[PDB]
Amino acid sequence: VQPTESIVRFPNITNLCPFGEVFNATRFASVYAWNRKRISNCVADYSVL
Amino acid sequence: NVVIKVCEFQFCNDPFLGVNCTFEYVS
Ligand SMILES: *[C@@H]1O[C@H](CO)[C@@H](O)[C@H](O)[C@H]1NC(C)=O
Ligand SMILES: *[C@@H]1O[C@H](CO)[C@@H](O)[C@H](O)[C@H]1NC(C)=O
Ligand SMILES: *[C@@H]1O[C@H](CO)[C@@H](O)[C@H](O)[C@H]1NC(C)=O
Numbered sequence: 434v435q436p437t438e439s440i441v442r443f444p445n446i447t448n449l450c451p452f453g454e455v456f457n458a459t460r461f462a463s464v465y466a467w468n469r470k471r472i473s474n475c476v477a478d479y480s481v482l
Numbered sequence: 483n484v485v486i487k488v489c490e491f492q493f494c495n496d497p498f499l500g501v502n503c504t505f506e507y508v509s
Pocket of ligand 2: 484499508
């Protein structure tokens with residue numbers, strides 16, 4: 434018997450790793466010194482931008 | 483909670499809690 438369709442399950446997308454603040458923050462800094470980023474865990478990225 | 487951090491820190495000669503972090507977590 435052949436597979437009638439494919440099925441995929443990965444858990445509830447949860448740690449959207451935060452692009453929100455890096456593109457919402459009122460106080461964007463001047464050229465010289467700005468901000469920075471780090472990674473925790475899970476899947477965030479998406480494609481909102 | 484359980485609370486966790488990876489912070490590069492200068493601990494004491496006898497570090498305790500009373501009676502620069504690239505990661506952190508809580509449970
Ligand atoms: C900034 O916040 C607005 C909602 O107030 C949101 O629609 C927008 O996508 C945010 N920008 C980013 C990408 O952080
Ligand atoms: C106890 O853990 C919580 C985790 O949310 C934290 O908010 C709080 O500052 C911690 N307090 C101490 C004394 O470690
Ligand atoms: C904080 O961590 C960065 C990692 O590159 C290091 O350059 C800096 O000297 C550290 N500062 C302190 C006070 O731990």
